[PDB]
Design an enzyme around this catalytic site. Structure first.
Site, PDB file in Angstrom:
ATOM      1  N   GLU A   1       0.892  -1.157   0.000  1.00 39.99           N
ATOM      2  CA  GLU A   1       0.000   0.000   0.000  1.00 39.99           C
ATOM      3  C   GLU A   1       0.911   1.182   0.000  1.00 39.99           C
ATOM      4  O   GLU A   1       1.575   1.489   0.983  1.00 39.99           O
ATOM      5  CB  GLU A   1      -0.852  -0.065   1.251  1.00 39.99           C
ATOM      6  CG  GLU A   1      -1.764  -1.272   1.279  1.00 39.99           C
ATOM      7  CD  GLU A   1      -3.119  -1.083   0.546  1.00 39.99           C
ATOM      8  OE1 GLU A   1      -3.468   0.050   0.171  1.00 39.99           O
ATOM      9  OE2 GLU A   1      -3.861  -2.087   0.366  1.00 39.99           O
TER      10      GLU A   1
ATOM     11  N   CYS B   1      -2.264   9.190   2.624  1.00 44.19           N
ATOM     12  CA  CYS B   1      -2.078   8.666   1.238  1.00 44.19           C
ATOM     13  C   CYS B   1      -3.190   8.964   0.241  1.00 44.19           C
ATOM     14  O   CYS B   1      -2.995   9.220  -0.945  1.00 44.19           O
ATOM     15  CB  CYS B   1      -1.831   7.178   1.312  1.00 44.19           C
ATOM     16  SG  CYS B   1      -0.137   6.887   1.927  1.00 44.19           S
TER      17      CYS B   1
END
Lengths: 458, 461
Positions: free
Chosen positions: B208, B242
């Protein structure tokens, strides 16, 4: 040079022309046409590469490829459509869905043992998922490699789907280029090299690797039936199959009857003079011939064991009372030798399998259903067939792949499509109902926190 | 040292203790109990790492974690059962199913920005799938790293689930050991390193990662709503997310009105004196603080720009007419700066995106649904929210993950279960019908091949 070929295929993908469903369907129809119109050439090339009859090439490779094309042609219209998902309390009134999309440029690295299936079956899925594709066929199956390079451009889009031939050095250079996915079938050691190259660019990989597929035989069962199924799966393609039963585990006293029934089955399948059977293949090359010979040294041969270097012939062979520390039990056999390793009972067999690397396949023969469930539940393998060998391969609905050392990822049918796609989640709200969002915006407060406890938790 | 720790966790996995559904349910209940009984401790730890209010920690981290546990406790008995599959003509009389199984020992490497969510959410999935788990929390969120190490062995099985603390060099040693799956959240360059180590043992990975999540604003929209939503998602956690909108793409003529509306929203969210607001966090350390400051050099600050080294405070900031070659547009901001890059139209926005690395999220604001669907079909990203930001993160239904440089693999809910399981196909036959198998056995013949074409390929005639 490898760099130019990749750029060409990337540019073709970036044009958008493989995105529409109808184009993809046309390319699969074209592939089907290729296999139909050029069947004789294809059969001749694979037959020469493995010394296999054209009947056997047709039934093993062509029929599998043709079945996979029809299955994709029938289900792909449903597979490309966006799928609504269940929403939650924050999103009840929005649109939410998961929509598949192509990865981009996919590299398929083929294996040599079923060199048409192991390149074309993955291709089908990659094509279906909208990607551009480079296939790099195994150099060890040379005729097949050449026929692929000659026929694909005659039927498929020449710039989206290409064949690059070569050996270790060419593959190394090709693995320096940037792909969006790499699919590799072969062996553990080269799997690590593939994965290390993919690491340089964070490219996802599917690796279909090998190992030693065990075959457990329980006393509570009909050995006539068991042994025929095993003989078929072991000696097909001369044992040069990842999914072949590599060895047998069973109680020591079964040995004699097993040996006898396999020998009788070998005679019905291959005749008295096995070297004359059109049904029994040859070892792929001299390096593998010698490797497989060396596994015979020191062993007790129950039958078979005849070899001939000049034609790369090794006769169907069974070994008894095999010690697990010898060479034949320390690497993947990938040839026509079947060792039997005695084990007192199912706990010992399960322990034996568990101390080793996780195989691609596990086979268990028994009428006892609890015994089969224990075996499944306490081991780990890519797939399992109870009371047969190989057949789990043939279901479209199953993911076919390894786990641990036998690999990662999976394919076949919809699993191919998903492996070569990104499933992209999309939540579409409207510019309305802005008053409600005050609950999530700062300033925070005890009351907003309590809102969350009451609506988001049980 | 790490070698021994991993061997201990592996032996506990090999005992079989984590296999029964009942045992996994107990562990998730124990985990929920840990979050409830030690909530105050947990909030204080995260609050200190990010200089964040307990209300915000609760609503962003703890709720998400508890929500994930409740989802699993409810669905897991269904997830672990064998699933019958569609058979074919050769297998119709047999039993065919897919059964999920644990991979083995799973390594979770945590990130510092949401240090409890990014460790514990993956952990829930790995527990639920029957694995042993080692968590390596980020060194940068030090209070949270320590409280996990203190709390987890008081509630969970102390050999199946451990915490190992340390930084780069201990992580490097830890990555030499053999895991059955490695889960990493962080940045592209460490992702490569994690994947390289995983390559040594053919260990599958979930990564990720990040990127610059773009945000396209069409002129046909309600800009007051658009700016509130962006303001919210941009300045939460100080933009240290993010999935935060990294930059804006829009027509130049909207810039003044975007700037004015962001400014009025920032006043509503954080007040006149933003340094006193308990809802606005701080940059995680001096290194990131200086990294972010360097992105302001050379830029036209339309709004904000105030900084303070001593408290690591950077005010909500907006830049106008940004040149995309400048440093602000060449790395992940991960900070409270919002650049605006003018584009004449949606085609220029699509090209701009497509020439860059595939981001983790993409955000599109427009009343015009066709244009939103067009931007989706012509780009690629990990996930998409139209007319809002962040919210796609919150559906349990959605796989959450990147694509290309923003990552590989996915998790959340059933996708975590799947990521931390092997789905094992089982075909169980009887010993009946042996005569019928002559069709597949040698010797082969023209008759058998022709029957295969007739029956198996369904060509009649």
């Amino acid at each position: 040079a490898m760099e130019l070929e990749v750029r060409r295929v990337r540019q073709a993908f970036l044009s958008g022309r493989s995105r529409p469903l109808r184009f993809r369907l046309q390319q699969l129809e074209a592939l089907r046409r290729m296999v139909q119109e050029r069947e004789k050439d294809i059969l001749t090339a694979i037959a020469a590469d493995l010394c296999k009859s054209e009947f056997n090439v047709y039934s093993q490779e062509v029929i599998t490829v043709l079945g996979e094309i029809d299955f994709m042609l029938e289900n792909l219209p449903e597979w490309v459509t966006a799928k609504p998902v269940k929403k939650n309390v924050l999103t009840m009134l929005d649109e939410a869905y998961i929509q598949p999309q192509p990865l981009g440029v996919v590299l398929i690295i083929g294996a040599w043992n079923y060199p048409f299936v192991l390149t074309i079956q993955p291709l089908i899925g990659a094509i279906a998922a909208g990607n551009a594709v480079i296939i790099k066929p195994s150099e060890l199956s040379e005729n097949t490699a050449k026929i692929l390079a000659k026929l694909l451009p005659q039927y498929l889009d020449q710039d989206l789907y290409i064949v690059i031939n070569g050996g270790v050095e060419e593959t190394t250079e090709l693995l320096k280029q940037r792909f969006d996915h790499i699919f590799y079938t072969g062996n553990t050691a080269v799997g690590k090299i593939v994965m290390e190259a993919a690491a340089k660019h964070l490219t996802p990989v599917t690796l279909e690797l090998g190992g030693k597929s065990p075959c457990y035989i329980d006393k509570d069962c009909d050995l006539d039936i068991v042994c025929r199924r095993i003989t078929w799966g072991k000696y097909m393609n001369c044992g040069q199959t990842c999914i072949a039963p590599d060895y047998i585990l069973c109680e020591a006293s079964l040995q004699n009857q097993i040996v006898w029934k396999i020998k009788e089955t070998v005679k019905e399948f291959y005749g008295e003079n096995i070297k004359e059977s059109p049904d029994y293949e040859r070892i792929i090359n001299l390096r593998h011939f010698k490797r497989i010979l060396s596994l015979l040294e020191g062993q007790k041969i129950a039958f078979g064991g005849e070899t001939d270097e000049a034609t790369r012939y090794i006769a169907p062979t069974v070994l008894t009372d095999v010690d697990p520390k010898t060479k034949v039990m320390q690497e993947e056999i990938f040839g026509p030798i079947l060792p039997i390793v005695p084990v007192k009972n199912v706990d010992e067999a399960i322990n034996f399998i568990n101390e080793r690397e996780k195989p691609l396949a596990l086979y268990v023969f028994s009428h006892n259903h609890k015994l089969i469930k224990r075996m499944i539940d306490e081991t780990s393998s890519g797939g399992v067939t109870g009371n047969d060998v190989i057949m789990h391969f043939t279901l479209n609905s199953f993911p076919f792949g390894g786990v641990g050392s036998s690999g990662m990822g999976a394919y076949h049918g919809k699993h191919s499509f998903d492996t070569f796609s990104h499933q992209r989640p999309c939540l579409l709200k409207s510019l309305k109902r802005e008053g409600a969002n005050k609950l999530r915006y700062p300033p925070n407060s005890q009351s907003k926190v309590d809102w969350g406890k009451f609506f988001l938790l049980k």
